[PDB]
Structure formats: C-alpha cells, structure tokens
Amino acid sequence: TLTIYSGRGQSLVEPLVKQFEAETGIRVQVRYSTDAQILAALQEEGSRSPADLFWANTAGALGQASAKGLLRPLGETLLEKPIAFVPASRTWVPVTVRLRVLAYNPDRIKAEELPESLLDLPRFAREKGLVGRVGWTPTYSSFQDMVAGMIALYGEEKTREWLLAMKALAPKAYPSNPAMLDAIRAGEVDLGSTNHYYVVRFRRAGYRLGMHHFRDGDAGNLALVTGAGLLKTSKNLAAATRFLTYLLSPQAQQYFVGNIGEYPLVKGVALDPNLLPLEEALAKSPKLDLEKLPLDRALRLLRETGVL
Numbered sequence: 218t219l220t221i222y223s224g225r226g227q228s229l230v231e232p233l234v235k236q237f238e239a240e241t242g243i244r245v246q247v248r249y250s251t252d253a254q255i256l257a258a259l260q261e262e263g264s265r266s267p268a269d270l271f272w273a274n275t276a277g278a279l280g281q282a283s284a285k286g287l288l289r290p291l292g293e294t295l296l297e298k299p300i301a302f303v304p305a306s307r308t309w310v311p312v313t314v315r316l317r318v319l320a321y322n323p324d325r326i327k328a329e330e331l332p333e334s335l336l337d338l339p340r341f342a343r344e345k346g347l348v349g350r351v352g353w354t355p356t357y358s359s360f361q362d363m364v365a366g367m368i369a370l371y372g373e374e375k376t377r378e379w380l381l382a383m384k385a386l387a388p389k390a391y392p393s394n395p396a397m398l399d400a401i402r403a404g405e406v407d408l409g410s411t412n413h414y415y416v417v418r419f420r421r422a423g424y425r426l427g428m429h430h431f432r433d434g435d436a437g438n439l440a441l442v443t444g445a446g447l448l449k450t451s452k453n454l455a456a457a458t459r460f461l462t463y464l465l466s467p468q469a470q471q472y473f474v475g476n477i478g479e480y481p482l483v484k485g486v487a488l489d490p491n492l493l494p495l496e497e498a499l500a501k502s503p504k505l506d507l508e509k510l511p512l513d514r515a516l517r518l519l520r521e522t523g524v525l
Contacts, residue, residue, distance in 0.1 A: 219245040219456045220267045222259070224252035224274040225443060229477060237463050243456050252278030259287055259448070269451040270460060275362065276302070276311065276442040280508025283308040288446040292458060298465040299482035301499050302442045304508055309446035312464045313479040316498055317363050317439040320416050321408040321427035322401050331429045335363075335410070335437030336371070339382035351388040352397045352409035355524050359412050359441050365515035366439040369505050373518060380522045401426060412441065414478035417491045421478075430493070433500050440502035443479070 223230050227249045234245050250258065252273045259266055259282065271288070273279045282288050288308035295310055296303050302311035319331065319338075332341045342351050354360045367376040389406055391397035394415040400406045402424055416428045431437035445464055451457050463469060467485035474481045474488065480495055481488075488494070493501070519525040 219243055219269055219453055219460060221245060221247040221270045221272055221460075222255045222268045223247050223249050223272040224255050224278055225249075225272055226274075230272070232476070233464070233469055233472060236469075237460060241456075241459065241463075243459070245460075256281050260285060262450075264450060266448065266450040268448050269453045269457040270445055271309075271448060272312075272443075272445040272464075273309075274358070274443055276304070276309075276444055276507040277362070277365075277510050277512055279309045279444050279446055280304070280506075282446055282448075283508065287449055289449050289451070289454075291447065291461070295458070295461055295465070298462075300484070300495055302440065302444075302482065302507070304444075306508070309444045310461050310465065311442045311444045311482055313443045313470075313473045313477070313482060314495075314498065315359070315441040315443070315479050316413040316430075316502065317359065317410060317437055317441065318413045318416065319408060319429040319431070319437065320398060320401055320411045321429060322404065323425060323427040325404065325407045326427060328427065328429065331408075333432040334435050335367070335431055336375070336379055338410075338437075339379065339386060342386045347386065347407055349387045349389070350407045351383070351386050352391055352400055352406035353383070353388050354391050354394060354397055354409070354411070355519065356390075356392070357394065360410065361512060361515055361519065362441060362510060363410065363436065363439050364519060365510040365512045366503060366505060367436040368511050368514055368518070369509070370436045370503055373514065376515075377518060377522060380518070380524055384522065384524060398424075398426065410437065413480075413492070417478040417489060420491050428491070430501050434503055435501075436503050438501040438503065440498070440507065442507055
C-alpha cells in the first residue's frame, strides 16, 4: 500500500510504477504536483500525511523536506548504489541527474569559439554579432535553478550583471525547450542554454545540434538532480524501501537514460553516445550544495531585472 507524492511528471513516472506494481504485487498510489505544492501539502498534513515517499523533480525541494525534518535516514546499502549526488543528510536518494548545457547550430557557431564560462556568453554574443539571435527559457524551472546556481557561485550582483547583459542582446524567450531547439534548428536563433536531454532527444530524431559544456566548475554546467525520499510519516517502510531500491535498479536506470534521455546514477546500463560519461559530468558541474540553491532569491532577481 505505497503512497507517493511526485513532483516528477506522470508520463515519466507511470511506466516505472506500473512495472513495480506488476512485479511486486504492491499497489501504489501516486499524487502528482509540483515540488512546490508537495512541500506545502506535507507541512499542511503533518503527522496525518498518507504519503510514504516523496519523488521530487529537484534536489532543492528535497533539501527543504530534509530541512523541515521530514525524511527518514536511508538503508546504508541504498546510499551505496548511486555513483554520486548522495546528500550528506542521507535523508534521500538521487535517481537521475540532468546537465545544463549550451545548445547551438554547428552550421552557424564554431565549437572552438564558444566561451568557457556562461558568464562570458553575452560578450560572446556581442562580438559574434548574435543580437536577437540568442534564445532562452526564463519561465523554465531548470533555467531558474541555473540562475540560483549563479547566485550561489558568483553572488547576486554578478548574476544581476549577467541577466541585464543578456537582456541587452534582445534574446528571444521560448515557452519550452523543444520550442527553442526548433528555433535553433530553423536558424531563428543560434544558441541557447538548455538541459542536455532535450539535445539528446533532437539528435535521436536525426537533427544535428551542437552541445557545448563550459569549463569544469562553471555555473553553466549545473547538475540538476532528481531524487526520492522516505517520509517520517510512512507506515509502509518495507514497500517504500523496495521502491527506492527499484528506482536504482539497472532496468529502471536504463528506462531513465533510454526513454527519458537523462543520466543514470548506477552501472549496469547501456550508455548513449551523446552523453559524456557520468564521471565527466560530475567533473564539469559546479561544486555546490544542491539542497541549498537560493531559488527564491533567483526568482526575486529575475522579476526585478524584468526578465520574468
């Protein structure tokens, strides 16, 4: 009788849940909301919460749960499974990771010429004549995560500097990443900060698209970790633990990299060619506490600068 509060989209979640159900005979009930609402709902429900598991789209949202003392420390051998991104808390387990990257039109942009730091992107745009030819996705959650990452790395004022310098390029805003990548393909824009798996998806469809990683440590390579946690309110601790174990199972991790295009966190999986190895991903990403990204601050700043 497993009850999951999921900030991950249903289309992604349901196949895995079906499998578990059929293979264990455990009946699972999943509630789908934003990481935001789930965090609200748990604080609301208190000890009267049905939820056994929290499966978040972001490690930020899990940091909050662990911050409101909501999660139960995990089976020593569980936190042993994933290759990285385990939280000091040991109060949730990371399931996939996604990378911020810079997508571009190989026909229009030379790989050699792209900046080693996201911070230098506007200067690149100005020199290379890309006014009106840069795309971004201001309303997109991972873009907002990236901006919070810049605030944590460089400070609010450097980040503000970057935002206003980006705005001064008259960049085009897209409602979604596929929309922006379509634009990149069409030549409406030349480049855009995105999530690596949107690019992997395009490439699988046959569309040659450039994928640039910034220098190691750079805010532009931000690791976007998804994860799951065992709630304190859980009265189904065996079944719940089985499911966490299941999420980290080779077959499920193959689903994540294959069906979804995200990075698996375990071995025993066949790896796409459009991904650098997991280990190099780690090497590339900024070293930050992913549970503590100042997302509220990023949002405030994005609205103030007039980006949002």
